[PDB]
Amino acid sequence: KMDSPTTTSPDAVLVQSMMAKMLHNGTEALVMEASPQELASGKCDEVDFDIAVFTNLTREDGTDEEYRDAEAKLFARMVDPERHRKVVNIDDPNAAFFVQQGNPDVPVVTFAMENTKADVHPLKFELSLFETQVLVNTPQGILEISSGLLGRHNIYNILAAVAVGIAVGAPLEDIVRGVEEVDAVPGRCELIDEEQAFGVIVDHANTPDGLSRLLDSVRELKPRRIITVIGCAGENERGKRPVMTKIATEKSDVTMLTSDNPGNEDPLDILDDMLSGIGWTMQEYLKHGEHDYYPPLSNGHRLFLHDVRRVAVRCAVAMGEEGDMVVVAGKGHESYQLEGDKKEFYDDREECREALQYVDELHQAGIDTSEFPWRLPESH
Amino acid sequence: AGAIREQLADLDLRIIIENSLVEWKQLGEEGPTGNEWEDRKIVRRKDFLVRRMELAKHFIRTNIEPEWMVLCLLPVLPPELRPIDI
Amino acid sequence: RRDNQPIPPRAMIMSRKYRTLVSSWIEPLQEEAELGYEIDYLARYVEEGGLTGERKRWVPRRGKTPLDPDAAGFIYSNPIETSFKQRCLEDWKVHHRKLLRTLQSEGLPVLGDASESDYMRVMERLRNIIKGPVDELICRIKLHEGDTEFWKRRFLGDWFPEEPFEAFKEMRERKVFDVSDMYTIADVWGWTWEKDFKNKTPRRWSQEWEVELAIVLMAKVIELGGVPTIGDCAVILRAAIRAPMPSSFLKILQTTHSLGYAFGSPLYDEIITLCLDLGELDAAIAIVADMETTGITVPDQTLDKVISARQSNE
């Protein structure tokens, strides 16, 4: 790895600097997320792109058609019609618009779940809480994959990956090794599985659209229950806090409100804004805490909040039975918990990793970690 | 004493008045019990509740925090007043 | 209203669950109403400066500042929340509790013409009326609380006499106490109205009575500039549903619609059914008549059956 300043889009002159550095060490292939603002701002001006891949356009991230042609500048870079290649996703209606951009004579490899006319299409796919198995019909031949990426929202990526291999003419066997090798992208629906009966998902979703898209993207995995750990940043985008709770409490059976990045704001105050989405208040929640019984919601779902982040993600892990699913959100790969002004080192992957390690010892000690009011052997 | 100090800080003095009053009202609702010992204890509890709410009513009308009954700093007498027992 | 003094915003303090004083006393206490449409908590968060400005957060914080905004400036706290039904019970309990004490003090002479056995009969009912989940002789038990003249008559009729009545005689001749010193605040200040406010049997709480008071002051709050919320109209309407009382449905809705409030369609389905479930099609036509004039779309489920019920009587 390395630690160049990851402050939005780096300076255009600075961007090309490490491209010399990687080439100085002898790097052969280069790949990077073609951020819509990055190429629009002109950061990638002298970058000699070779393979263009268009995942999908939803515009949920401004303009409507100008945003479309803003992404088209990536394919407008494509002047060479015989050497470099294009990759598009037919399922997106804008693919026809994108393929017209640049030189029309460039070879194009087409992938999609539907439109069986595509070069690569899934003949048969299965969704499981721990892996996804898909049979894809490449032009060269039928290929079978089974990776740790969960949900159909990443089948696009899997279909794109094999399609890119066809574009560069990669052998079918070698494509299997590359796809199979990747099993956990940090913070992007990452599955952390310490050989337990229910998977743990770490995701970077913090927006109402991202969380809602994620939660219904895990219901298709056919889980027994969904457990969510969601937080919000302090003193920033405070208008989304009630929305997150409303979405989580509906999609998920059990929700775990927590402090994501309290900053200078009080962690309990942030949770109070969250409870406003369901009409609850922090005072009302603590009153139920006195009675050691948190009532279920109107739909029958559970809402368990705890301000302390470390004791919350670990607690949610112990709350999962066989077939359930626990998803954490708001952090992803960011390994820091912003409390006040200090950025305390906090990584959710380590939390879920350790919680799964010692959850069995908690159960073997007679601790009933099914609902939030844990029933110890000496209780009541 | 840390348990006591935090418990004193956590006290909802408004709530203490409310639930003590209704509990005190409830005790007198039954009235006599026919047993001297039981009537002896019902008087003690009622006077305890009255003393409790009276203590609470004084705290919120003044600037005295109940946490101060559990001190974390100990004042020291000036040396002149304790020449060379205490 | 007599002094044309508008209701201050402090009086119309917006409590949690969005129920002002116009409906805060109804039986569901601190409970949300039953609007047909689902609540819009996101809008409530937006309107309470929740985006960037500030929000009144209900986090209980350590200290002696009362969290409840209604407790601001009382001195100790707000009076403990009690419903109108609960308040009626306490008055009902305390009035009979006073009757028992007066009955216990004399027993036979207060009854006068009753027998000793009847004295126990008028006690068990009084005992049962209190803490409870016939010749009704209790009507002659007259309480004289605040009646200064009554107590003066009973006062009139080295060591003070053992007999309390004779002791009263000793005080008057010894100038310790006399009727001239026997007075209260009411009579010296000419509180004539105070006489007819204490020695009366309280009316037991009735649901039909509660909504009558609910609609009476809701109009009065309107006349004084107060604006009851949408939740307030729903709660008083629901109280008008628990007891049937179909007559008050029309006057509730027109006042509700006068403020621009529009109930949800499923609630409108529920109310129209109740207005002909028990066979009260009279006044069950005006409910759907004026609501169309105000601009509320009646669901076809009710429209088809109310028209079908219209031709049923024909």
| DSSP-assigned letter for residue B53 | H
For residue A135, the SS3 value is strand
Dihedral sign for Cα B29, B35, B41, B43, please: positive
Chain A, 52 to 71: residues with Cβ < 8 Å from chain C are none
**Is residue B70 within 8 Å of residue B4, measured between CB atoms?**
yes
Dist. CA C112–CA C104, nearest whole Å: 14
CB contact under 8 A, B17 and C77: yes
List of chain C residues whose C-beta atoms are within 8 Å of the C-beta of residue B60: 64, 76
For residue A368, the SS3 value is strand
List of chain B residues whose C-beta atoms are within 8 Å of the C-beta of residue C60: 12
Give the position of tokens 């419903």: C83
Contacts of C273 (CB under 8 A, 6+ apart): C302
Ramachandran category for residue C75: left, alpha or beta (phi over 0 → left; psi -120 to 50 → alpha): left
User: What is the token pair recorded at C253?
Assistant: 């809705």
List of chain A residues whose C-beta atoms are within 8 Å of the C-beta of residue C42: 242-243, 246, 277
Dist. CA A17–CA A15, nearest whole Å: 5
Give the position of tokens 């490449």: A138
CB contact under 8 A, B13 and C80: no
CB contact under 8 A, C60 and A279: no
A/B Cβ contact: 3+ pairs below 8 Å? no
Other beta carbons within 10 Å of A111: 29
CB-nearest to C76 from B10, B60, B65 is B60
Dist. CA A150–CA A100, nearest whole Å: 32
User: What is the token pair recorded at C190?
Assistant: 């000419």
C/A Cβ contact: 3+ pairs below 8 Å? yes
Max intra-chain CA distance, chain C: 94
List of chain C residues whose C-beta atoms are within 8 Å of the C-beta of residue A234: none
Dist. CA C220–CA C210, nearest whole Å: 15
List of chain C residues whose C-beta atoms are within 8 Å of the C-beta of residue B17: 76-77
Alpha helix positions (H), A252-347: 267-275, 282-290, 310-318
Give the position of tokens 């407008």: A76
List of chain B residues whose C-beta atoms are within 8 Å of the C-beta of residue C76: 14, 17, 57, 60-61
User: What is the token pair recorded at B52?
Assistant: 């409790």
Residues in chain B after which the chain is broken, C→N over 2.5 Å: 84
Dist. CA A162–CA A169, nearest whole Å: 10
For residue C11, the SS3 value is coil
Q: Distance from C57 to chain A by nearest Cα, in Å?
A: 6
**Is residue A279 within 8 Å of residue A247, measured between CB atoms?**
no
For residue B24, the SS3 value is helix
Dist. CA A56–CA A265, nearest whole Å: 37
Please, what is the Cα angle at A367 between A365 and A370, to 5 degrees?
A: 145
**Is residue C200 within 8 Å of residue C142, measured between CB atoms?**
no
Alpha helix positions (H), chain A: 12-25, 36-40, 65-76, 95-100, 155-167, 172-181, 208-219, 241-251, 267-275, 282-290, 310-318, 348-364
Report in angstroms the alpha-carbon separations of C257 from A124, C1, C20, C168, C290.
58, 23, 18, 66, 10
Q: Assess A250–C contact: CB distance below 8 Å, yes or no.
A: no
Method: cryo-EM
CB contact under 8 A, B13 and C64: yes
CB contact under 8 A, B59 and C71: no
User: What is the token pair recorded at A126?
Assistant: 């299965």
Residue of C nearest to B21 (CA): C80
Burial class from Cβ neighbours inside 10 Å (0-12, 13-18, 19+) for residue C237 reads buried
Chains meeting C at 3+ CB pairs closer than 8 A? Answer: A, B
Residues, chain B:
86
Mutate to test the interface with B, among C68, C70, C75, C76 (most CBs of B within 10 A): C76
List of chain C residues whose C-beta atoms are within 8 Å of the C-beta of residue A268: 59
Contacts of B76 (CB under 8 A, 6+ apart): none
Chain centroid to CA A283: 33
Residue of C nearest to A279 (CA): C41
Q: Distance from C47 to chain B by nearest Cα, in Å?
A: 30
Q: Assess C59–B contact: CB distance below 8 Å, yes or no.
A: no
Dist. CA B24–CA C155, nearest whole Å: 34
Q: Distance from C22 to chain A by nearest Cα, in Å?
A: 21
CB-nearest to B18 from C62, C64, C80 is C80
Residue of C nearest to A242 (CA): C42
Chain centroid to CA A306: 23
Residue of B nearest to C81 (CA): B18
Resolution rounded to one decimal, in angstroms: 3.0
For residue C75, the SS3 value is coil
Task: Tell me which residue of A152, A153, A151, A157 sits closest to A129, measured CA to CA.
Answer: A151
Tell me the backbone φ, ψ of residue A175, rounded to 5 degrees. -65, -35
Direct distance between the N- and C-terminal alpha carbons of chain A, in angstroms, rounded to an integer: 52
Q: Could you give the strand order of the β-sheet that contains A51-53, starting from the edge strand earlier in sequence?
A: A51-53, A85-89, A108-111
Task: Tell me which residue of A308, A331, A307, A304 sits closest to A316, measured CA to CA.
Answer: A304
Dist. CA C13–CA C8, nearest whole Å: 9
Dist. CA A236–CA A238, nearest whole Å: 5
Mutate to test the interface with A, among C17, C45, C52 (most CBs of A within 10 A): C45
Q: Distance from C60 to chain B by nearest Cα, in Å?
A: 9
CB contact under 8 A, C80 and B22: yes
- Looking only at the bridges linking them, the beta strands covering A325-328 and A200-202 are parallel
CB contact under 8 A, C66 and B14: yes
Please, what is the Cα angle at A250 between A249 and A255, to 5 degrees?
A: 25
CB-nearest to C42 from A269, A277, A282 is A277
CB contact under 8 A, C59 and A283: yes
Q: Assess C60–A contact: CB distance below 8 Å, yes or no.
A: yes
CB-nearest to C77 from B9, B14, B29 is B14
CB contact under 8 A, A282 and C60: yes
**Is residue A205 within 8 Å of residue A228, measured between CB atoms?**
no
Q: Assess C77–B contact: CB distance below 8 Å, yes or no.
A: yes
CB-nearest to B29 from C75, C77, C131 is C131
CB contact under 8 A, A282 and C16: no
User: What is the token pair recorded at C287?
Assistant: 């409910």
Alpha helix positions (H), chain C: 41-47, 84-106, 108-111, 116-129, 148-156, 164-174, 185-188, 207-223, 230-242, 248-258, 265-277, 286-294, 300-312
Other beta carbons within 10 Å of C301: 14
For residue A108, the SS3 value is strand
Tell me the backbone φ, ψ of residue A91, rounded to 5 degrees. -55, -30
Contacts of C58 (CB under 8 A, 6+ apart): A272, A281, A282, A283, A284, C16, C67
